[PDB]
Enzyme design. Structure first.
Site: not given
Ligand SMILES: N[C@@H](CCC(=O)N[C@@H](CS)C(=O)NCC(=O)O)C(=O)O
Ligand SMILES: N[C@@H](CCC(=O)N[C@@H](CS)C(=O)NCC(=O)O)C(=O)O
Lengths: 208, 208
Positions: A9
């Site tokens: 990630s």
């Molecule tokens: N804007 C957030 C993005 C977080 C994000 O894209 N996380 C993803 C994986 S890379 C995630 O937790 N997806 C699972 C979900 O939203 O259910 C940040 O910068 O931390």
């Protein structure tokens, strides 16, 4: 300091590199999204938005990678070099962080996500938006060694995470001469770069 | 303090409300995007990304609404109430600001922009993402009068700009009881609300 993450990630990797630059030890807790571990009641109590990265620092649950980066510098930084006290210097860094989220990484997500997650055909129009974002970054970097001030800041670290994700996606970074110069220097000076690249190569699996 | 803007623009309205809350006079400079005024060489020298809002404060050019909001509080705020000194309190506000950009307003843009700007058919799947974002905001607001602390902060002001844009788009905000309660209170307490609503009604023209 607990850190819920996956190495692939991009937002998780920005935090890894920042924590290393600050010198703060993270208790790294893999949170298997493919297993739905983020969606279990126990995790929702920590982060109801169920996203990684999530930090838990002495009772304080925090998510959004770029918020976590700043918090780690403000709380743990021996000096403020990565996020200076000056509101003007902070504002430039803040603008670059919003650029990284809403323009640069957003262009990544808009173009690659439907392909890698939904198995959809590439949209050549969304590709043009990536090119536009890189063109802006290239202009920002004209005559500048770092993205948001005289030295390395959390803005560079965030952008390194994003641009390295583009590299593993096989995007032609070298076409943007200032971005390429900045990026290659950033690899050499940014703490945690090797672990970030390990994570990029993990994420590459989505392109197999 | 020069402020390049259009009243209809959500990110511009967040800055208007913040400047009013701080008590900082803006020299309001309409920048006609429909005329391409943002794309002229003279503006590109100020903001090469050619976006509104753009602030020019004593030689310092800054864009990204949420960076501008924080900068105005840090530089002009008589007190830090809207953006407290505490890194923990700041981090919550920062997370909400990234939520506002990357989740809530992003859902607005993903769903409404192709319709209002490209004249494309609505995507019911993108609509589901709006609902998801409101559901998260609703959970954040459980037992809380404000979005990111005990009192009104730049996070509320940013979210007010976004949610009011959803209101004029005819989105069913009342379905999210905590959001609705928070939003109705926010209208009453947020400096500059009336000018924000004037701007929302201007933006409504895109839905005619
Ligand atoms: N804007 C957030 C993005 C977080 C994000 O894209 N996380 C993803 C994986 S890379 C995630 O937790 N997806 C699972 C979900 O939203 O259910 C940040 O910068 O931390
Ligand atoms: N993330 C930016 C968004 C800026 C933005 O969406 N501005 C639009 C109008 S609402 C714009 O300047 N579009 C013109 C362009 O990009 O060329 C912010 O919060 O300030």
């Amino acid at each position: 300091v607990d850190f819920y993450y996956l190495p692939g990630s991009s937002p998780c990797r920005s935090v890894i590199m920042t924590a290393k630059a600050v010198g703060v030890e993270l208790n790294k807790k893999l949170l298997n999204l493919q297993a739905g571990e983020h969606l279990k009641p126990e995790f929702l109590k920590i982060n109801p938005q169920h996203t990684i990265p999530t930090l838990v620092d002495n009772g304080f649950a925090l998510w959004e990678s770029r918020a976590i980066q700043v918090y780690l510098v403000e709380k743990y930084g021996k000096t403020d070099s990565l996020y200076p006290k000056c509101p003007k210097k902070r504002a430039v860094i803040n603008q670059r962080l919003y650029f990284d989220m809403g323009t640069l990484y957003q262009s990544f997500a808009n173009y690659y996500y439907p392909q890698v997650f939904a198995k959809a055909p590439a949209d050549p129009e969304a590709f043009k938006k990536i090119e536009a974002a890189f063109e802006f970054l290239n202009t920002f970097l004209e005559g500048q060694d770092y993205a948001a001030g005289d030295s390395l800041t959390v803005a560079d670290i965030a952008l390194v995470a994003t641009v390295s994700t583009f590299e593993v996606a096989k995007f032609e970074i070298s076409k943007y001469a200032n971005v390429n110069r900045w990026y290659e220097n950033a690899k050499k000076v940014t703490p945690g770069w090797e672990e970030n690249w390990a994570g990029c190569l993990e994420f590459k699996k989505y392109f197999e």
